[PDB]
Amino acid sequence: TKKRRNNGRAKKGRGHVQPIRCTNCARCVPKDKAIKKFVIRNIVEAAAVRDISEASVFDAYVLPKLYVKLHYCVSCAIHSKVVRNRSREARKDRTPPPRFR
Amino acid sequence: SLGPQVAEGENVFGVCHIFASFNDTFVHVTDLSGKETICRVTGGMKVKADRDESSPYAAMLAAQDVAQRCKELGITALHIKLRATGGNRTKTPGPGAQSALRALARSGMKIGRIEDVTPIPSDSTRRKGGRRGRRL
Amino acid sequence: VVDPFSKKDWYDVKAPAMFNIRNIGKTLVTRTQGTKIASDGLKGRVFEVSLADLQNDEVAFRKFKLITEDVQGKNCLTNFHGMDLTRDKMCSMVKKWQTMIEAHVDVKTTDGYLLRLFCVGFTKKRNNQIRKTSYAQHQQVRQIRKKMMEIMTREVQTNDLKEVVNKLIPDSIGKDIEKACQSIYPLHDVFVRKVKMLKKPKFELGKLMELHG
Amino acid sequence: TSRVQPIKLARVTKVLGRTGSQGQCTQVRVEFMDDTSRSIIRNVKGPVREGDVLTLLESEREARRLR
Amino acid sequence: PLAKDLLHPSPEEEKRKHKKKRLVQSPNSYFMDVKCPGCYKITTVFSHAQTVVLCVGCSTVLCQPTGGKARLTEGCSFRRKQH
Amino acid sequence: MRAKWRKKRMRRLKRKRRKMRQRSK
RNA sequence: GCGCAAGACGGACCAGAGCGAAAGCAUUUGCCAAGAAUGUUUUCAUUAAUCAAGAACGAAAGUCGGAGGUUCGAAGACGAUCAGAUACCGUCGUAGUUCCGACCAUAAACGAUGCCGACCGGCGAUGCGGCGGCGUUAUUCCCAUGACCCGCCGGGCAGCUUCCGGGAAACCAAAGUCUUUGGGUUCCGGGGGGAGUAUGGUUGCAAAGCUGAAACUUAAAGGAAUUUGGCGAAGGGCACCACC
Numbered sequence: 001t002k003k004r005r006n007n008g009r010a011k012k013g014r015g016h017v018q019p020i021r022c023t024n025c026a027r028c029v030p031k032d033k034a035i036k037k038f039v040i041r042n043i044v045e046a047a048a049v050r051d052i053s054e055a056s057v058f059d060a061y062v063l064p065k066l067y068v069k070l071h072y073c074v075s076c077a078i079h080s081k082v083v084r085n086r087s088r089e090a091r092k093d094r095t096p097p098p099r100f101r
Numbered sequence: 102s103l104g105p106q107v108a109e110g111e112n113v114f115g116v117c118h119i120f121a122s123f124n125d126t127f128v129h130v131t132d133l134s135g136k137e138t139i140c141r142v143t144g145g146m147k148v149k150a151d152r153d154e155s156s157p158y159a160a161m162l163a164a165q166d167v168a169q170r171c172k173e174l175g176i177t178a179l180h181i182k183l184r185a186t187g188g189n190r191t192k193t194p195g196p197g198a199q200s201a202l203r204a205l206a207r208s209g210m211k212i213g214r215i216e217d218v219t220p221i222p223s224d225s226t227r228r229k230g231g232r233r234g235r236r237l
Numbered sequence: 238v239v240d241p242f243s244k245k246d247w248y249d250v251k252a253p254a255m256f257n258i259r260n261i262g263k264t265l266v267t268r269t270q271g272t273k274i275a276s277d278g279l280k281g282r283v284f285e286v287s288l289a290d291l292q293n294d295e296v297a298f299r300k301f302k303l304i305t306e307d308v309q310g311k312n313c314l315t316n317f318h319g320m321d322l323t324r325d326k327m328c329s330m331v332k333k334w335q336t337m338i339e340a341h342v343d344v345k346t347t348d349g350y351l352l353r354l355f356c357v358g359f360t361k362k363r364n365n366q367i368r369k370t371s372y373a374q375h376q377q378v379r380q381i382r383k384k385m386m387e388i389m390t391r392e393v394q395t396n397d398l399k400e401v402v403n404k405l406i407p408d409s410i411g412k413d414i415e416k417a418c419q420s421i422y423p424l425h426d427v428f429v430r431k432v433k434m435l436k437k438p439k440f441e442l443g444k445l446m447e448l449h450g
Numbered sequence: 451t452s453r454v455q456p457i458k459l460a461r462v463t464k465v466l467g468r469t470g471s472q473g474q475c476t477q478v479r480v481e482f483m484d485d486t487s488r489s490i491i492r493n494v495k496g497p498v499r500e501g502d503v504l505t506l507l508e509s510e511r512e513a514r515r516l517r
Numbered sequence: 518p519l520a521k522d523l524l525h526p527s528p529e530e531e532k533r534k535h536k537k538k539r540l541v542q543s544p545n546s547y548f549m550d551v552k553c554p555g556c557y558k559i560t561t562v563f564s565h566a567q568t569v570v571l572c573v574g575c576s577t578v579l580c581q582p583t584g585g586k587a588r589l590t591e592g593c594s595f596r597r598k599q600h
Numbered sequence: 601m602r603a604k605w606r607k608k609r610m611r612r613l614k615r616k617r618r619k620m621r622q623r624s625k
Numbered sequence: 626g627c628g629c630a631a632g633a634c635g636g637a638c639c640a641g642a643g644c645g646a647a648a649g650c651a652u653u654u655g656c657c658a659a660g661a662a663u664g665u666u667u668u669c670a671u672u673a674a675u676c677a678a679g680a681a682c683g684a685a686a687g688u689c690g691g692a693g694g695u696u697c698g699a700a701g702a703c704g705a706u707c708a709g710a711u712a713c714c715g716u717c718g719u720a721g722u723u724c725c726g727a728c729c730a731u732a733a734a735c736g737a738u739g740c741c742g743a744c745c746g747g748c749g750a751u752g753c754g755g756c757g758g759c760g761u762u763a764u765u766c767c768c769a770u771g772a773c774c775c776g777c778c779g780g781g782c783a784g785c786u787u788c789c790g791g792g793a794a795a796c797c798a799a800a801g802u803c804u805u806u807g808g809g810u811u812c813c814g815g816g817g818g819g820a821g822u823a824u825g826g827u828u829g830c831a832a833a834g835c836u837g838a839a840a841c842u843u844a845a846a847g848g849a850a851u852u853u854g855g856c857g858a859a860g861g862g863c864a865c866c867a868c869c
């Protein structure tokens with residue numbers, strides 16, 4: 001039984017792409033098949049941001065962020081509840097969930 | 102053993118490295134040039150249990166040790182230099198760096214520019230493991 | 238066992254007149270024991286700073302490498318060694334669905350100072366644009382890289398280190414880059430990301446005194 | 451550890467849902483009357499009606515969800 | 518369309534279509550003539566030159582080879598001829 | 601019963617039969 | 626933290642994007658050679674399509690000779706896990722991994738769908754080249770130039786929808802134009818095991834690659850989808866025969 005419209009990745013005219021490595025795993029999943037994440041994280045999220053700011057010598061100093069990205073294998077991503085399964089009638093929904101915060 | 106800088110005029114500025122992996126926490130402090138050090142402390146200094154090597158309490162105790170050492174030496178303002186693991190293993194640091202920095206800010210020191218000095222490669226050699234991964 | 242802070246001196250360095258703020262920090266070297274002089278121990282030192290610690294009130298996300306050259310007692314004289322941006326700014330300016338252009342020329346100055354200037358460039362998305370892709374062809378990037386290398390190697394080979402640094406404290410090379418490269422494809426973000434030094438001439442003292450005034 | 455905790459008083463206004471491993475810890479939103487600018491969220495075990503004064507001895511850290 | 522008449526549509530319909538999908542078969546390019554502003558002799562040139570051409574008398578080059586139609590030298594008067 | 605290790609073991613017995621037929625003279 | 630030295634690789638930029646017959650291909654620069662598409666009122670004039678013989682290329686792993694081999698890492702060595710592990714896990718670790726030659730021609734080398742050519746609907750996008758048309762950007766006026774926008778043309782990866790139509794259904798704008806059955810052409814299969822097995826030939830130093838049985842047993846082996854199952858699957862709600 002064929003499952004999807006595509007083959008499950010972003011290979012449609014190439015045949016082979018470069019392999020990448022997972023973060024919590026080490027599987028050599030291809031780049032067009034894996035799951036990426038462009039996460040933005042501050043140095044202090046909500047824990048002691050006022051304690052950091054009031055201890056700062058420089059007036060009007062803003063904390064920087066950490067723009068790092070991670071690569072997940074499919075089993076590693078489904079174990080960490082990153083992606084979730086759904087039904088067949090809504091499986092053709094490429095649109096991401098909405099962003100608010 | 103004592104510095105000629107006055108505690109009423111301005112504050113001195115050193116740099117301190119924090120290396121915070123998923124199972125180890127280093128808190129090291131050196132001079133501004135980085136040639137010579139001041140003191141150093143790991144997570145597993147007083148807590149002899151291995152399981153607390155990556156814990157908020159060990160990082161908090163390490164930051165208190167740096168706090169007491171820098172207060173008896175007279176070092177007030179610090180630049181925090183954060184390192185996650187180094188190399189091609191991971192990129193996101195653990196939760197020990199957060200507790201170490203908030204315990205440094207809790208004691209009473211002053212902070213300046215903070216940044217990340219993680220040795221990011223262009224791309225390194227083969228990762229420690231196999232093709233199928235570190236399954237468990 | 239015993240604290241060696243009894244044998245611990247306290248020295249200070251001085252920024253050149255090419256900057257504005259003279260004092261940047263302090264160092265803690267040990268004493269002199271005849272066979273172990275502390276004069277050479279102050280030689281091999283690189284000081285890491287920011288822009289607001291040296292110049293006046295403007296934006297500050299750049300770093301400067303400062304290496305000492307000679308000491309005579311209770312003071313140190315330094316000089317330019319390298320320049321670099323912030324890693325946070327570098328990893329923030331990398332945008333998805335935008336291309337990046339880089340170039341380098343090992344350009345030699347008037348004196349024996351040899352540098353290695355790096356450059357980076359990102360294209361500009363227009364306000365009228367509806368297409369989200371906004372890429373450029375390979376020959377466009379090649380000609381942009383050729384113009385960038387020629388402009389960057391023209392401004393360094395004609396002058397000494399102090400003049401090109403004083404041109405490098407504001408954005409003059411970058412202002413020339415988005416002045417001259419917008420005729421082929423509009424780009425908005427060019428910083429000199431890193432300047433690496435390779436070789437120096439014979440060591441002297443008049444240059445070291447004249448960079449401080 | 452040499453920390454001092456001054457006596458500060460709180461008064462609840464809104465109550466959030468009831469958390470915990472077995473489901474007994476209650477998340478509440480307090481409002482100080484020493485100053486009308488600081489509100490902290492903690493865990494309380496017991497009946498709390500909205501608009502009732504609450505006792506505190508230390509206030510520097512918030513509360514997690516379950517563990 | 519059901520009863521789409523392909524005998525004689527509007528000329529815009531044959532204009533928008535391809536040169537070979539057109540039901541009466543005819544190309545789109547044409548012949549032209551153009552002179553030099555400081556000369557008397559005027560010569561003819563095809564719309565797609567594919568070689569660089571100069572006007573007679575060996576005074577000033579006239580056209581330039583492009584992927585499409587040949588672009589003319591600035592400041593030259595011309596008109597399309599037809600028969 | 602999958603085909604890979606079945607084919608591997610049966611290739612091993614193929615090689616054993618080949619060497620036995622070689623040295624059977 | 627500062628220098629020296631070796632080897633490997635070129636992240637983020639990198640996309641349901643490009644190129645190539647496929648296997649495959651990402652630091653800049655310099656040289657050589659080839660090619661799709663676009664445009665053409667240029668030239669030869671049937672040079673055409675598919676192909677038994679035969680031929681080229683071909684991921685990794687494998688064998689023969691070398692300088693040199695960072696990191697990772699078959700077989701193996703040492704500890705914990707385990708009723709029992711010579712498995713998962715950790716530390717070392719040889720052959721290998723990279724380069725120059727010499728070879729076998731095997732993958733889920735899969736779009737599990739041969740090539741050419743004609744036809745049958747739409748929508749909005751991206752990539753190349755050409756084309757027409759408001760208005761902005763390279764010291765304020767024109768021109769074509771690079772970019773922005775609105776439409777058209779040809780080829781390619783495509784996406785959405787469609788009682789066109791097809792199919793056992795999954796699904797397909799081809800897997801359609803088929804009992805209303807014939808466009809041209811190459812390879813290839815008749816219930817399931819035995820068995821890609823033995824023999825024979827063939828190539829190879831080497832592993833094996835190609836070719837390819839018989840006896841006997843067997844009435845099922847298989848493909849699609851539905852109904853409550855049953856999940857150390859996910860997500861909601863309830864119970865003091867559950868908990869606080």
Ligand SMILES: [Zn+2]
Pocket residue numbers: 022023024025026072073074075076077
């Ligand atoms: Zn994983």
